[model samples]
Target chain A: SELQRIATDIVKCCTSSSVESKLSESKFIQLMRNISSGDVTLKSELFSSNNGELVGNRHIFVKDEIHKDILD
Target chain B: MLRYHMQGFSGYGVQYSPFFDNRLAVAAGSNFGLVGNGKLFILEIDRSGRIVEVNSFLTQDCLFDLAWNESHENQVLVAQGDGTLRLFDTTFKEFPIAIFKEHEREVFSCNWNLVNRQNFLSSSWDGSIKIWSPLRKQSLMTLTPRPLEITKMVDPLNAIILKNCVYQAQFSPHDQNLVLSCSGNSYASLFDIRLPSGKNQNNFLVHSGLEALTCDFNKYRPYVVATGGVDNAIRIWDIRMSCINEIPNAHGLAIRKVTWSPHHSNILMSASYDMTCRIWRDLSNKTNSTDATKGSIFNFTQHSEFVFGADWSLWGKPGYVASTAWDGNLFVWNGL
Candidate 1:
């Protein structure tokens, strides 16, 4: 019954759009940080600083053009 | 059984080449993918039934997953911890032929399109799935799994948290436009690329409130999909988002990966943090004995640490499987 309620709540959450505009990148990242911090292994990995050099060419996508327009 | 040790590297993913029965690839990180460099090993099974390393490539970040190009025998793609994907051809010694960088977080999984063979997909911790064509310089499209917004409104003080990490994404073997993915938010999503961006996604909660780590589509059954989670449960669902079968307590720890058999519709395999790889048969259709253990047929406890990767051979006998672990050993054994 508890699982059912949670499932119903999830469905209600996804279908309603009242709070859609309130969504921000910061809140998303905050949730992710919280999730990572809960895991000791992942928290350590995310906090550590490591120096490594990339070995290949870095390709950039052209701006202001629809990527789908060129392919289709 | 055959074994090969990856010195100073912990294996994260393994794949058997489609073109050669004797050839396989292993993706590894220097320190369990927490920090340091990554390596990709191209291994071959010799005439004397010995596993030998044919070639290897080093990378700046940890490699979490990899996929071989369906059309090109020598080319392979690796997902890096620095949110980049590198395309390396085994014929070349040092650097990757191409680099794709867009994800803001670690790229956890990459899978090539099985039907079209023209494109591939990558899922990342940044909460997006990107599609890429080897010929193009940029990704063709990006799909983000939208979070549930009502939770913030319903209970502002203690709303259910939604994690944005997309753990794994895969292209449907039978359809060029269909994709399946599982995320840290406990949702398993289905995306149809043929539709418009916002309207193309269908997400379902498969693991209650826990994180979903892995998911896969059955190769023969068009609508069947399987998902495993941190809850140690395996749930089978249809494309309509109905949970058709459930195996609770499928492992002692979080399931890191789950794969449906390419040859058999009923066979499924999983790797787990419990330091074991297990094979199961979906007996939901059977009217036989009611066993308490469910469909678990075999448990492989050979690995000393977490078993993160498992793949069935595509070329030779169908039951042959390969598994790799944080113990830095890769094992190839018969599942039957």
Candidate 2:
């Protein structure tokens, strides 16, 4: 839960500023990448996710379902 | 599907213009990009709703990929097999307006930055990704292999060397800093060019044992990504995790491209050597079950040969998509 909370905060902090600044976008992203890669709890939760559909926790796209087609 | 035959040429890449939904371009080669001449065909839907070739440019070598200049409607960048990037203007029937030369081998993919429209990224089989601005003579930046000792000592954060053919590299649609690249070595790496030094900040084993041919950032979710490759499966990754989900029978052969919908976060479309185009949505939003197959939206099987490229329209009514195939046919259709 703490890891998930931190991940949530990271997303919020990074996306919060749509305003371009002189600080550059890469600095902020590098910090995020650093945090994600360094925290073992955070890294395992993000890299080794278990909530997905497949045995390896992979997400799948289903076919033959009712899909909406936009007509022009 | 609205189909236009390219006849003698084998298609390698396709892209929709940012200015017009019905307008798109196809990059192709004479012998499937292995050898021979190249051609770039600009196609647009006539008022009658029929897809037709509006103009074309021929090159001395195979054209593997292309990206439209969002700042200027008339210009497009084409990656040539001879290791050159040609900037073509639709007004000029012959000769490129400008040429970028740096990559030592074939450049397979090029993508214009959606947020920073002035610059674009190109990946090459030569094992480098170069960021170029149209206004400059030299690249803004080039990420290449470095000696491990020097790399670790100088900037341990960015010294990541792919040592393999980089098939596709793209700036995150959601951020200007994050760059994602997939390579022939089955890895998709994340690089933040800001960290004072290293080229690689993080790397993901995208396709496990297979070459990761193509990858795309999810338009709706900043952290989500989709990748397809020699494994013949389309896998979605969270970037935070290894694999979120996977789709089997994704194609009869290797998948060449996968693009998320510019209009919806949950929707995405893919092209394959199997000669088919597929659409998928993240089903986790609709159902609680962890079945990955439930996310398939549908597929377009109009191309007779390998489908190398596909792009969801960003301008028109939603669901408009363009696909280019090795059979030399460009198909425009509603990909819902």
Candidate 3:
């Protein structure tokens, strides 16, 4: 879970250099610290991102085949 | 990837030189090497283009720029990041000849006035262009730019928080009064160093809208200026005309630094955020033509990260090109 969380954080940071984020250096550092400290509830309130990645648009959005069938 | 002579060191400034006695030509606080994460290193290559000596890690800080000053005096002045210029005699090691009297912000550019040894101009994040005289006990002159105070903070370009912040500057080779500067808010402005010494409106607006400017004087024309920055174009300005009349996109990205070769009139070189030291030669200026177009003769694109700074060798050999990277590796390419 920690590994997955870290990978997600890395991805989040990677995608923020474009138009979606205007966060400066200190803000980026602060955001990383907040996420690591389990500030998810506050993160959702602040970013309101769909995947909580703080990134905008351009995801292909495909559900896993097994999960779709089992859940249905 | 492309094999050439490769050695490396890092220095504070964009200029450097070689020595005859040649003890790597790097020393702490003696040159523009920064401290902590900033410092300098040197590697010597011989006639056969082979690395002979590696003087690893000389200074301790990443200062501003380095230049060999005074043929009469064998001293090297290191422009510190803090606009504090330190001078060290090549033969002796004493306290630095002097320090900046007033400027406190990060010095972006500095140069030795070859025509007049007693004076030099330094530009800093402080937004004003200053002329200094070590001989006299005071600043020779100062040209403060027009203050840009935007009332609103939310406006992107007009963010009131960022006022005039100068990034790079230089004195015109032809006229001592001509000043060129790249400022914080993505623009370049030219000024008269003397005109601003006493008045409200000092420098002239040669060209207005620009981003991240770095400039030098035209070797041939006294009033002509060449500038580069965020637009990824090296534009030549006829200060007399007040226009960005000629522009050539010499580098792939924003030009970090650009300098004309002291010897080669048509040859100009620059370092860029694209991680390369590109050489542009004016092909049109075969004799005395003005419409010369330049292209890259050499490009050192190997740093694997952003190339911070680079410079030509002192003696005008097809010698070595040095580059610094964010990954903390300073390299010297002598084409061995």
Candidate 4:
């Protein structure tokens, strides 16, 4: 249970903006290895931009391409 | 309206030149592009608007597709069954100005980037999609092989393997990082070059699990894409929705090409094996469509065999389309 808890903390730290800014390349690789070997669900909510807060609609894959005089 | 016979060759792909009001090109082969050399017919519409051949070029292998150079009016790129990409200068056609050979299998499609103007893409049966710059002797990048590597699978996948023939690849009309491709695997994939290789991309299943032969981006809408396949269906996918709407039974046989209207966001046209061309409206305008079916606006059935190539005019008039088929017929008609 202790190891599971520590693994979860690593994923949180890797994804969190506060600690993520400070994470080194080697440390990031080590964190990814732990997540791959450990059973933990990465929160999708943690992956959005700081400004992505809005309606809970999780899916918005297609970006808008249409504009004035697009075909011309 | 006008029609012309290709003589001994069967047409595979037809495109209108962006430079001339009535000038067009047809890529044709001897045996349905399976085996033999190819011939490219450069045609023009006379002052009265009747189609006529202006010039012709001979290739060493079957030409499956072609794209007019966006930068140069007299230049065009042709994809060949021999796996070579040839750039022909229409001014004089003794030989190509450049020849690029990289794919091991037949090359099926070539589309120039509408926004970038300098680069183009080609997809092939070899399970690879390649990007090229007209000025460079070598390809800029190869987008497959890693996703294509698989041992054995009961079902076909669109990652560019033999089970799935990668048919079409085109850059987003506006976004340089986004490239969309569809294949025999019955799926459409969006690749973002800005994101890491495996990190930023998505694939959406299209059709009734049949071979996806052609796809195109909506010139006006960045997120909208249209695909047609052997299932005789035309599907529109909105990447944000992760859902697809269909025009079920779009054709009597397999659809070879689906191209979005150059002038409008809602209109599109498809060429099919049933020897007909159809114009359609994007029915699922999700302002949301939990469920809705779009249908055709007009049916052009002048060709007598499989209609392999079709394109909407970029200028002159909107809704004008040019199509070529196995029946040795080339048709240019106004769809309004």
Q: Write the per-residue lDDT of candidate 1 for residues A1-72, one digit (tens) a residue.
A: 443354345334432121232222222223233334332122213322232322112222212221222211
Fnat: each model in turn: 0.02, 0.00, 0.00, 0.00
* Range of the 10 consecutive residues with the lowest summed lDDT in candidate 2 chain A: A54-63
Rank ordering of all candidates by lDDT, starting from the highest? 1, 4, 2, 3
Model 2 misplaced stretches (Cα beyond 4 Å):
A1-72, B145-163, B285-293
Candidate ranking (TM-score, best to worst): 1, 4, 2, 3
lDDT of 1: 0.80
Scored against the native two-chain complex, candidate 4 gets a DockQ of 0.01
Per-candidate TM-scores read: 0.80, 0.75, 0.64, 0.76
Candidate 1 — which pairs collide?
none
Chain B TM-score, structure 4: 0.91
lDDT score, candidate 3: 0.52
Best-fitting candidate, measured by TM-score? 1
Better of 1 and 3 by lDDT: 1
Kindly provide the TM-score of model 3 when superposed on the true structure, using C-alpha atoms.
Answer: 0.64
Candidate 1 wrong stretches, greater than 4 Å: A1-72, B147-163, B285-290
Best by DockQ: 1
Tens digit per residue, CA lDDT, model 3, B1-336 = 211222222333434553442223332222112222233334454655544434332222345665556443455555555455555454433234445545777666677665555567777777777777654436777776553332133366664667666777776666666667777565556676545333433243322345565777766667666667777777655666654444455655567777766666666667765656777665534311244444556766555434556665655456455555432445566521
Question: Where in model 3 is the C-alpha error above 4 Å?
Answer: A1-72, B1-12, B18-37, B40-61, B71-73, B92-95, B135-138, B147-163, B196-210, B242-249, B283-294, B314-321, B327-336
Docking level of model 2? incorrect
Model 2 agreement with the true structure over A1-72: per-residue lDDT tens digits: 554466457656543121222112432233344445543223301232333221111112212121122211
